[PDB]
Design a protein around this ligand. Structure first.
Ligand SMILES: NC(=O)c1ccc[n+]([C@@H]2O[C@H](COP(=O)([O-])OP(=O)(O)OC[C@H]3O[C@@H](n4cnc5c(N)ncnc54)[C@H](OP(=O)(O)O)[C@@H]3O)[C@@H](O)[C@H]2O)c1
Ligand SMILES: Cc1c(S(=O)(=O)c2ccc(=O)[nH]n2)oc2ccc(Cl)cc12
Length: 316
């Protein structure tokens, strides 16, 4: 299958990228260098992951060594919730660009639809633990994102963790200048997202699946939790195809015309996870994997459930 998908901005996006959430700063530079050496051309980043400087060291070294050209990379980062105010969006982007040592991003996403009070804290809290919101709304944040396209800092803009009513809000924005190119959302056999995906795709918005392996290193994992990598039913599909379970979990979203961004800092697993272009899941396999849906989310957060734009009350 083709390795890139066409976006509504006219550019092509690698359907496999390397995730970097939780990648330790002392390990992520080698992880990204390895990833580039074994074929990855898309890296998924965010300011809030607190490791963009070290990701950028790897990107810069591989451009300097002429392993890849900048035009061949697809680098993505995200606007954190404490920077949704108009006046803060450019600087937040510029900080990410400086850390990543780039002069443009291929894609910049609103990380979450929820804006928070600006300041040093990523999750500003009131005395009872609720996140303190920003009154800026998401349409004004979108316009500020549009300005970054028109200033040359980013080639595409998009959104992340937006539910279909919030996607619709952007699409219906008065005076909309650029549609979102991507909506990046959690997606795996336990959270198959058929409704949201169909909606986005119907509107020409490409979807990126995050936590495709079920984020087994998520800080809040509990023992009683489902585990994709250990699901005997997924293992059996992998064994049938002579691939690992992870390879199946990565190939699954690819065949739904999604982009997917598995994370690893383990060199052998970085390589393993890229070796997913040499086999196909049958339709039956795909429908079987879709059948494991249980609306189970890695990424949900109680401190933000009262925010007016919290995305996961809505059915989708
Ligand atoms: N937009 C957002 O709100 C959002 C939210 C969550 C995630 N994301 C993005 O999506 C990326 C992926 O999601 P994620 O980090 O939550 O989790 P994930 O990719 O589902 O899982 C990563 C975990 O799987 C392990 N792993 C990787 N390859 C493996 C393999 N072949 N076999 C067995 N274990 C393997 C990794 O271990 P090692 O690293 O130790 O090898 C790590 O513990 C993130 O890193 C981030 O870039 C975006
Ligand atoms: C969950 C959750 C998080 S997170 O789990 O810290 C996260 C993980 C990874 C990542 O990339 N981004 N955030 O931050 C949020 C901010 C707003 C809302 Cl409404 C929900 C959340």
């Amino acid at each position: 299958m083709a390795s890139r998908i066409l976006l509504n901005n006219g550019a092509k996006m690698p359907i496999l990228g390397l995730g970097t959430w939780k990648s330790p700063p002392g390990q992520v530079t080698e992880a990204v260098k390895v990833a580039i050496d074994v074929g990855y051309r898309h890296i998924d980043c965010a300011h809030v992951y607190q490791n963009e400087n070290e990701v950028g060291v790897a990107i810069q070294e591989k451009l300097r060594e002429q392993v890849v050209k900048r035009e061949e990379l697809f680098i993505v980062s995200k606007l954190w919730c404490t920077y949704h105010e108009k006046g803060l969006v450019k600087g937040a982007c510029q900080k990410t660009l400086s850390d990543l040592k780039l002069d443009y991003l291929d894609l910049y996403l609103i990380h979450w639809p929820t804006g928070f009070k600006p300041g040093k804290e990523f999750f500003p809290l009131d005395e009872s633990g609720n996140v303190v919101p920003s009154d800026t709304n998401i349409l004004d944040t979108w316009a500020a994102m549009e300005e970054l396209v028109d200033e040359g800092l980013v080639k595409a803009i998009g959104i992340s963790n937006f539910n279909h009513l919030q996607v619709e809000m952007i699409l219906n924005k008065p005076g909309l200048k650029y549609k979102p190119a991507v909506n990046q959302i959690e997606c795996h056999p336990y959270l198959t997202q058929e409704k949201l995906i169909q909606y986005c795709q119907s509107k020409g918005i490409v979807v990126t699946a995050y936590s495709p392996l079920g984020s087994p290193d998520r800080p809040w994992a509990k023992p009683e939790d489902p585990s994709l990598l250990e699901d005997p039913r997924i293992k059996a599909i992998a064994a049938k195809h002579n691939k690992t379970t992870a390879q199946v979990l990565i190939r699954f979203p690819m065949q739904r015309n999604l982009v997917v961004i598995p994370k690893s800092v383990t060199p052998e697993r970085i390589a393993e996870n890229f070796k997913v272009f040499d086999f196909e899941l049958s339709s039956q396999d795909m429908t079987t994997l879709l059948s494991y849906n249980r609306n189970w989310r890695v990424c949900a957060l109680l401190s933000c459930t009262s925010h007016k734009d919290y995305p996961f009350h809505e059915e989708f």
